[PDB]
Symmetry: C3
Subunit: 455 residues, 3 copies
């Protein structure tokens, strides 16, 4: 058979698995081994977005699952354990396995049990693994996917950094950024209408202070999976080009491309060389996914500028929106305080500050000053202070026509922003009221609910 280098030699190796976005070290090995893999399924609530909880089903406690790294020709003894707290049974299908179900039948595992099967890794490449338990779509949509790398016998070329990034589409009963513990929504899933499309299982998993890092000059390899369940990723890097893209274990390698399609359940290895400092955005270039549903990740490059290659500034909230900042933890706090019944004005102000970036500042500015005659000010705005209910209606329904603000005429259009949730509108408005010599006070989510319901 291809990839057959004999029986395993040396000692049995207990595989070291890593959580995203990190990868285990190169196998660095000239002989085939028996590799023992132990993976445990855990079902648990985590934050899919700030103040938004979801019950994930995970291989190893993360979405995506633990990264597994072996060598072509290895004999893999795969142990799957299903944690006693689990409610569902689970199993695994690994792409790149040669045999029925990729492991599915022999890895079937009830809560509190363990299963094992053995396989030879005949096929070199980067491969998706996922759960394979009826209803399969439900399991994958709850986060049951990861990557396994089968290295070529001589290993991969050395690089300065290796990272692990995995897209997934998610289906919540609530709309995007609607707070609370969100159930899985089977209707949306059957219709291929995700509420969130994410890298590494949460909004902002790889933005701000959780960005990936490298330096000018260094090479970076990214192992990129698409767990689906349903979407095909127009996978793209903003501001750069991939030196190489290779799908699965495929013999073809594409070079110098910026945009590449990754099928549902597909995987690729991309190589990137850092040339100038700043933030490079990994996105699904089906744009509403990247900018309205959470499908963005940051590779942040540090080092000397090169004005002869690029004279411009680092990314900011104009493009990246509220993810230009280090985090939006103020939103989490304000949500937790709402639940507990201890929500203060300052909680709301801090949450609104986080949310105002991009969403409002793109026209009104970060300091609320506007641009005279073009964008009216929110700083010390007579128009705002004059009527706070009207301000709620402007955010929800937009505004057009001639207005006067601080003694100057505006005649333009503010688009409606109806997708904002009640709490986001309330927090943003509360931030504005308490900034820039505005009169203070607060707007509550419940005030916004009433205005939204009014015909």
């Amino acid at each position: 058979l291809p990839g057959d280098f004999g029986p395993p030699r040396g000692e049995p190796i207990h595989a070291v698995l890593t959580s995203p976005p990190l990868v285990p070290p190169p196998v660095n090995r000239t002989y085939p081994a028996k590799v023992i893999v132990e993976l445990e399924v855990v079902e648990k609530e985590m934050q899919i977005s700030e103040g938004v909880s979801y019950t994930f089903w995970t291989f190893g406690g993360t979405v995506p699952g633990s990264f597994i790294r072996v060598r072509q020709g290895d004999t893999v003894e795969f142990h799957l354990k299903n944690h006693p707290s689990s409610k569902m049974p689970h199993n695994i299908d690994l792409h790149g396995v040669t045999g029925p179900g990729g492991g599915a039948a022999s890895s079937f595992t009830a809560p509190g049990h363990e299963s094992q099967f053995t396989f030879k890794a005949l096929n070199e490449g980067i491969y998706v693994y996922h759960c394979a338990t009826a209803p399969v779509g439900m399991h994958i949509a709850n986060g049951m996917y990861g990557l396994i790398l089968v290295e070529p016998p001589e290993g991969l070329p050395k690089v300065d950094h290796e990272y692990y990034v995995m897209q997934g589409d998610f289906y919540t009963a609530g709309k995007y950024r609607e707070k609370g513990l969100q159930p899985f929504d089977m209707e949306k899933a059957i219709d291929e209408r995700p509420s969130y499309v994410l890298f590494n299982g949460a909004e902002g998993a790889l933005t701000g202070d959780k960005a990936l890092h490298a330096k000018v000059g260094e090479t970076v390899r990214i192992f990129v999976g698409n767990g689906g369940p349903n979407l095909v990723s127009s996978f793209h890097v903003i501001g750069a080009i991939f030196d190489q893209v290779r799908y699965e274990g495929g013999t073809n390698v594409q070079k110098n491309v910026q945009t590449t399609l990754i099928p549902a359940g597909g995987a690729a290895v991309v190589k990137f060389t850092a040339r100038v400092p700043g933030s490079y955005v990994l996105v699904d270039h089906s744009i509403f996914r990247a900018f309205n549903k959470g499908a963005m990740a940051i590779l942040k490059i540090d080092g000397a500028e090169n004005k002869l290659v690029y004279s411009g500034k680092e990314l900011d909230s104009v493009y990246l929106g509220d993810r230009a900042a280090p985090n939006m933890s103020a939103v989490t706090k304000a949500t937790q305080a709402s639940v507990s019944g201890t929500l203060t004005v300052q909680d709301q102000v801090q949450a609104g500050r986080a949310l105002f970036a991009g969403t409002c500042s793109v026209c009104h500015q970060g300091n609320g000053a506007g641009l005279p005659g073009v964008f009216p000010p929110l700083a010390k705005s007579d128009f705002l202070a004059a009527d706070p209910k009207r301000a709620m209606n402007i955010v929800l329904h937009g505004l057009n026509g001639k207005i006067k603000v601080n003694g100057q005429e505006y005649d333009s259009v503010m688009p409606p922003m109806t997708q904002l949730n009640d709490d986001e509108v309330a927090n943003i408005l509360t931030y504005v009221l308490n900034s820039w010599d505005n009169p203070g006070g607060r707007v509550s989510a419940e005030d916004v609910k009433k205005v939204r319901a009014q015909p």
Copy 2:
């Protein structure tokens, strides 16, 4: 011109067309010929799923249409006939034809008529053909697509088996598995929301006793089309790898890939080598299509196990669900009996048995025993017998919280299964009631309709 090998020589050849999943034999020919192709359009009702009828519009009585096999450089005389029973006019656009419409204008054919045009096959490759009659989307969605192979002059490499598989997306007024003659739904089609996504024009067309077959060691070529009309297939083989994938007549060939995107109206040739016995699943790896809408087909490999490559078991209902069995003909029977007004308890029991596999057995087991403390039993269940209306509500709406069943406490979650149709719920429950020393009786679809309608 390219692919020009002179005028046709020898005798005129009447092309031998085959129905899916089979392919005509290699042309096996060193000279260009005049090839006469006769294809007849037939409009007819067939089963798109068990007890679910659809009026298909077909090239040659099948979906996909008859496979056409010629040699590059051949002069093809194409005859299209539209059966007198047809209500619509039809025509053909063949990909790989050099000329306006791929044949569309000259092949326009009213019911009871015949058309012909001639073309030279300049372009080697595997190509989609489809109907090209306004409204074009309606025709293609009713099943009017197939494949034509233009062999290279020396022919393709010899293999042990050649098969013909074609994906399509379908748009019914009813939901998935909703019984009866289902009309075409233009709204769903415009929205790209298929109710079914199928290989070879029906659920289970290529599963169970209709699987494709080969033996360990043999090579298999599959001609894979995507008729659409709308979907792009993340085409994938579970448990194996494609040695080669080649799109259309393209010069590039990809090797050792498991997952490949096939555009709407695209076609590929995949090669597969059987290495270990068992069932290999062809799927659209946009998962809800493969596991909720019918997009799965089986290549079943027979021969000696090889425990050094793979130690595990054959696929079963955990992964494949109700398609692990040879067929679900009991469902067809129970549906026909409902229509006729002769539905017996045993009809329902047999239909429910077919439907219980995967759908319920994944947690409750095939024998209904459950797993003590984890999954409650349906076998001899006091809880079930205690209240059959409640059992209907559990299937539709799920169940959580503490319960007692046969003197043991359970505290878990059964997800709702609201996508099940009234008859499926009724048949499944009737099967359960009449198995495992349960008290018998029956649930009717109409009982389930009332429970579903209750607020």
Copy 3:
């Protein structure tokens, strides 16, 4: 760095930009230059379809934006100006730029202002540029995308024609062909449900008298972009094959393919050789886009027939529908007349004539004669004249069963055509009434609204 050929030499060059579907001439240059690009954003209403207006946001007054053509190694000084009449701020992200945001942060530009940044063009290839201003999806969906070509240092191979074609998906509050100024619809956009999918920013932008042109024998290069924001194009040429397809600046080139996937925000260069005369259709082969939402463009080839390659006729309304004609300007006129309150019978007749092609003529014929016993006549139809309200209901709801028309029995099915708008139905019926010795008179959109509303 790669693509570094030294500092700019010679004189500064002011880049010549072209509107679609044309391309600037080859740079024809052996040395790196400083190239100055000046692009102005204009927001304006244009016809997205006949009698249907949309407020586009454009780079240079067109959708797609002005084509930019430079050489690898050039130093580009990019000036973006935002026209004083603009309501929104805008910026640019150019694919192929090496640096954060592809230009986004430094090109941020308020109405009435100008920005500039400089970059070196290190990466050869065809690249999308688009606006990058929060909310990014809204800007791109309003038409803010184009192509930039970075030529290899030796330039591209000479061809006879070079054209510029760009797909986009659009989201209107109204349905397809619903008349009036249509607002942008954020809900449809988030859901990836376009109302229109177009080449070059309008239905018929490249059909009829606006087709692209070449002659038998000539080679044609097309620069093909997919601006999205959301859709992946199954990009296909009907009746031909691409000699070459190359994505972005990629080293891989595919040859002899007819169907190719272009990611959202991707771009390709296709080469085509004209072999026989007639109309070749560029489509997104997700069929409902091409035939129900406007995703078709025509390359019309003139020259001698070659009956040995293809014996058939030129494309007509059977396949192309109402776009087989030179234009549908009568529809624009009738819509303008409705708005002004001067709509005459002849306005309606001419608009209905344009709309009847394909939509009705495929079965009833262009002369309304039908086919005796198979398709009943609309020419001098007693059945039509007998009841005009019934005729309205037939178009909206279809017709089946036995009928008699001009003394002959028909027993067939006319499908419903409910997606037709009130004005289209009214105009079509008014055309029929006033043709072929029918009794004349007229149907108004308001008559059709009442019939449509009746239960």
